[PDB]
Structure 1
Amino acid sequence: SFSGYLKLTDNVYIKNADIVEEAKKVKPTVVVNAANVYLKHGGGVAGALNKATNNAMQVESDDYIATNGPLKVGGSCVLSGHNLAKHCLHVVGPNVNKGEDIQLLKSAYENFNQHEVLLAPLLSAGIFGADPIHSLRVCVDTVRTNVYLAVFDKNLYDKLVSSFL
């Protein structure tokens, strides 16, 4: 199971880790991807997870989009986890660098409540432009299921833990 996580609340745990390496090690039932509405896994967590699947995540995603159209900002879809997890829950947090409503971050985290346990990144953090401290607060106040957060950046991880209310 998950190891080396710091317990933040009854159900939220956090670790300074590369989510790709964490997924390859644990092989969780669900790994969360920081997706965009088109499931175009170019950079950030999405690009890293997709590269770990040898682009199989992108091929599967393009077929999903061709059939279903784009996701909504705040929405999600369950696809294969390939070599990383049983499933990948592609969740679209608002990208404030693309001018999207930051209030949609709570709706994005609500998708996590459909899964008993997840390995996840902080939604809308990193290249999505939101304040990661705000993302962690929305996560703890929205997610009721067991969420194991992987924060890649050590300096950000330390700031998140030291500022956690």
Structure 2
Amino acid sequence: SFSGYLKLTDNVYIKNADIVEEAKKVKPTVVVNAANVYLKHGGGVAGALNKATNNAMQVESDDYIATNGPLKVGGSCVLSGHNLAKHCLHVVGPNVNKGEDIQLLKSAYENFNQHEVLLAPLLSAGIFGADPIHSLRVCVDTVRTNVYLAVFDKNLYDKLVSSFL
């Protein structure tokens, strides 16, 4: 069960934790991956989640692309969670450093509403270049189901809690 979270709003909770370790302890119904449109999990949260499955997530993802084609920015797909969760919801936030529209961050977070409870990272807040505090605001304004956010970096976590509480 989710332990040590701080409740920010009626439905958004936050913890300073590594999402891979949270997934292995809780084994939630849904873990969110911060993915790209071809589901190539090369680094960031995507690389860490794929490595914790010993590349099983990548083999499954390449088969999903071969049959279905790439996702759209703001879109998602549900695949196995392997040893981390029952399911992995792979969500594509905009890569604003490559000119993708920040408005698509709202569409990205809307995918979370299809699941009652999710363990997730902040979208577009890694190498995708969005300001992480702006990404948390979009999450709060868009997600209506129960989301447990895991923020690895303690300096970032303290910044987020100071601005949202």
Same fold (TM over 0.5): yes
Task: Please give the alpha-carbon distance, in whole angstroms, between the structure 2 residues aligned to 1:123 and 1:23.
Answer: 17
Q: How does 1:1-165 map to 2 (within 5 A)?
A: 1-164=1-164
Task: Please give the alpha-carbon distance, in whole angstroms, between the structure 2 residues aligned to 1:157 and 1:93.
Answer: 20
1:98 deviates by 2.1
1:40 deviates by 0.2
1:112 deviates by 0.2
Q: Deviations over 1:124-152 (max 9, x none)?
A: 00111100000000000000000000001
User: Which secondary structure does the structure 1 equivalent of 2:112 belong to?
Assistant: helix
Structure 2 unmatched ranges of 5 or more? none
User: Which secondary structure does the structure 2 equivalent of 1:127 belong to?
Assistant: coil
User: Which secondary structure does the structure 2 equivalent of 1:155 belong to?
Assistant: helix
Q: Which moved more, 1:89-98 or 1:141-150?
A: 89-98
Task: Please give the alpha-carbon distance, in whole angstroms, between the structure 2 residues aligned to 1:150 and 1:75.
Answer: 21
User: Which secondary structure does the structure 2 equivalent of 1:14 belong to?
Assistant: strand
Task: Please give the alpha-carbon distance, in whole angstroms, between the structure 2 residues aligned to 1:116 and 1:52.
Answer: 24
1:97 deviates by 2.0
User: Which secondary structure does the structure 1 equivalent of 2:88 belong to?
Assistant: strand
Scaled by the length of structure 1, the TM-score of the pair is 0.99
Q: Deviations over 1:49-107 (max 9, x none)?
A: 00000000000000000000000000000000000000000000001122211110000
User: Which secondary structure does the structure 2 equivalent of 1:40 belong to?
Assistant: coil
Task: Please give the alpha-carbon distance, in whole angstroms, between the structure 2 residues aligned to 1:154 and 1:17.
Answer: 8
Task: Please give the alpha-carbon distance, in whole angstroms, between the structure 2 residues aligned to 1:153 and 1:97.
Answer: 21
Task: Please give the alpha-carbon distance, in whole angstroms, between the structure 2 residues aligned to 1:38 and 1:79.
Answer: 14
Structure 1 unmatched ranges of 5 or more? none
Task: Please give the alpha-carbon distance, in whole angstroms, between the structure 2 residues aligned to 1:99 and 1:66.
Answer: 27
Task: Please give the alpha-carbon distance, in whole angstroms, between the structure 2 residues aligned to 1:48 and 1:95.
Answer: 19
Task: Please give the alpha-carbon distance, in whole angstroms, between the structure 2 residues aligned to 1:24 and 1:92.
Answer: 23
Percent of paired sites with the same residue: 100
User: Which secondary structure does the structure 1 equivalent of 2:72 belong to?
Assistant: coil
Task: Please give the alpha-carbon distance, in whole angstroms, between the structure 2 residues aligned to 1:97 and 1:106.
Answer: 17
Task: Please give the alpha-carbon distance, in whole angstroms, between the structure 2 residues aligned to 1:60 and 1:29.
Answer: 18
Scaled by the length of structure 2, the TM-score of the pair is 0.99
1:155 deviates by 0.2
Task: Please give the alpha-carbon distance, in whole angstroms, between the structure 2 residues aligned to 1:71 and 1:105.
Answer: 15
Task: Please give the alpha-carbon distance, in whole angstroms, between the structure 2 residues aligned to 1:17 and 1:101.
Answer: 29
Q: Give the superposed CA RMSD.
A: 0.7
